[model samples]
Target: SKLPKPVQDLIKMIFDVESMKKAMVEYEIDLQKMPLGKLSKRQIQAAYSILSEVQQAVSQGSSDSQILDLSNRFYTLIPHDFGMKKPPLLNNADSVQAKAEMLDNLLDIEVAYSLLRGGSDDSSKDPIDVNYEKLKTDIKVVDRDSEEAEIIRKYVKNTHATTHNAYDLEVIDIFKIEREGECQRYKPFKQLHNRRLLWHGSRTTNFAGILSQGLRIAPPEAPVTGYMFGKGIYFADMVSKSANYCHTSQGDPIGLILLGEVALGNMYELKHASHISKLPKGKHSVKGLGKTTPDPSANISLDGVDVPLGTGISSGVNDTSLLYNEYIVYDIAQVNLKYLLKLKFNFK
Candidate 1:
């Protein structure tokens, strides 16, 4: 389907302006690398004049398309780390430590599972019943001390601390039984089970393993804070991630998610600048254009924006129906980390 003609024209204009700006920046960088004596004053002045005009045009543009084109062009001209590739591999021990951290995250999953399996006082109902033997066979006990042990300690000491000795002992008995025999060992099937349980337990089905797998494929350094979109953006509030909806300086709906050390505006600007600085130096016919930035200024103002009516452009529909359905669930699986450690030692 064809885009609204207005939007298409806007995007194309943005692309062309951005491409030209990029080329100019690349030329300047190359020029600087050459001996200063090789360049005439006239050539340098001409380059500066061209850059100034582009900047002015970008700053003064009123239309969304024009502004977007200007912003993309400006960013394209700036030389920076935006395009530099990250190293494919890290230092050996660091890699191991990173993996260990991800494994440790699994403890959260175990606790969540235990809670669902009637690990709490509300044991009258087992929330999700599954075959223990099958579950045991499928789970991989990566580190009993870090994963199982931590969860067990927290659950017993906190959730069931007030229970009678017999009840506590019953819980302990169950933990002991689960920890014994071949189920104690980490196996591929067990790992798969553990992952599945973690996925099912959490609001987000994709967990550390999925993230790890994604990183393995792309292997880029974490984005220096940028916008997020789609279902993930909507659920950012439910998870540890942070997100916000706003408009650019030129009013466009944008959803943003920050990652890594860079703050919002700086990160976006840096990325934009880096992209601009890498373009090849040359004059070319500029065509299509589109621009997006991570800066908060790019967001629409929440105040004073007219609400739309019904499904129409002016309809002021706010999707706050699910706002009150907020919840947080703690994990209380009856696995003891300390005991698991002791068992590991005994096996060793």
Candidate 2:
């Protein structure tokens, strides 16, 4: 129930547009040594006298935080400066391409929201090639307990991890795992997460899921999926006791990896893997080649506290060898779901 304060005030107003272009270069009105196509006939008459006095007090209505507070009371309506042209001479090319596409989608969502904060653009390379026959032809052979397999394990336990690393470069399908052979990277354990809440569109849908899924998981009919044999991570290895059981039909071990301090969403620094011990299957196995040594270098985890970006999807996909090589499949760049899709294309 957050965001949409005019797209979080236009991504916090472009981090303060370089401090309002350095306070208009200390108001000598010097937008980087003037432009080629004119401006400031006295700063375009105080910029349309502040957009004809804030577009006639925004007549009926307007937003994007009241058009960025009427472009901060006019400094050439802050169009990425350069002495803010156009409006000074009045030649509306359709409101100059709507304030130049909201200042270029607010600097492309401020460089895709600073790669979801705290520095990034990670990858040590390798994570491609996985059509796997167009993602198992969109799986769903049917019935694991039916009802969409309990709405795909209640959407992998309330989702998390999708807010912005440029939407982790466009994926269509990725969820891998394979033991006694190899394939199980990305393991900064400490229990991170991802998303699938089906948008916050519920101003109040189905009574916020019958009083929040009948008081948080009391066997009601919730919905959110990941298994019909489709994408999966299900994850493990925070302290590995038979790697704590993520998907082997849960006969005995139901730990699913977690020691002290978990919750790090947007999967920090973006790599994790280190728990390849193998040889121990008894949830009743005909084929339990599970975890038999594939330590692809487990790069970083064990810090703590990361979640909080649209967070949702709880847990699923450990049907004990549903076999896609047990499971592990990423092709490339995931986590950072473009902040609810750049506020649902709301570059207002």
Candidate 3:
């Protein structure tokens, strides 16, 4: 009752154990073996190890027999429900990438599940408040008439035109969130130069883990092929570029996106995908060049952090594979999430 309807629905989904179980089932994970509160990081790591081996075998063009053996081992570790059909070989980039992403999702699912199941039993307060406290994140609603809300609305409207226009966004609730201990972890990078507030979006199912653990880079065992500029935390100057990652659809149109203060000390610019393992001697992050970028002149600073609210303009970046600029930081500590926005997708 204390929160808006949308916020209540959002929190309920984030903490709902049944939905997490359903997600595992849809991923074809054998719940009998990998039930919530039972899945562990070590188990996910073991699964990651199998995917890495498959990636290696695929890259080397290993024999089909060898690949088959490896695939069976993976299936054995991470039991799946194939019903009567044969389990597909994890021998190609796409299939291997899919499993790797599944494993990633499983890790977060475990986190969410454990959080819900953990701590002492005291259901005296509002269930929603109890759930919110479990995240250790303070989420306050931003007033519609507030300057902060106005800036966010403008970002959504202006950036909406540049990419994926078939879908529109309605800002259902804009929350000023501060996760406990996150600020302390991010303090070291607070003084780093060239920091800007950028957008990072993900499926709403992942927000509980995200709020608890903060944004993370892909696990080291995950295949490098899935990442555009290596396995790093990615952000966008344009809202839609990040929003599309929410993977929203007509059936489930609600999504959550983040605005983070990224500490990008210096950039190593690239026009195409580079599976980089390390940065140059002095560069701090990667900038995937795009044809269009926010106009530099219209950048505004809020609370000492630069906000790229400039209208989209041609970047004069010819011969680039990217349509919108993307920022990648290899270190997780380089990010401090500033705001969390819950949006509803409107399809016409």
Top of the candidates by lDDT: 3
* Root-mean-square deviation (CA) per prediction: 27.4, 23.5, 2.0
Instruction: Indicate the worst ten consecutive residues by lDDT in candidate 2.
Output: 215-224
Worst 10 residues of 1 by lDDT: 339-348
* TM-scores of all candidate predictions against the true structure: 0.17, 0.19, 0.93
lDDT of 2 by residue, 215-265 (tens): 111111111121222222232221111121211122211111111111223
User: How are the candidates ranked when ordered by TM-score, highest leading?
Assistant: 3, 2, 1
lDDT of each: 0.23, 0.26, 0.85
How far off is residue 111 in model 3, in Å? Answer: 0.3
Candidate 2 segments exceeding 4 Å error: 1-56, 60-77, 80-104, 111-171, 174-348
Tens-place lDDT per residue, model 3, 193-215, is 88988999987778899998899
Better of 2 and 3 by lDDT: 3
Preferred candidate (TM-score higher): 1 or 3: 3
Error of 1 at 137 (Å): 32
| Ranking of predictions according to lDDT | 3, 2, 1
> Which model, 1 or 2, shows the larger TM-score?
2
| Model 1 lDDT tens row, 242-307 | 111111111221211111110011111111112121223331111111121112222221122211
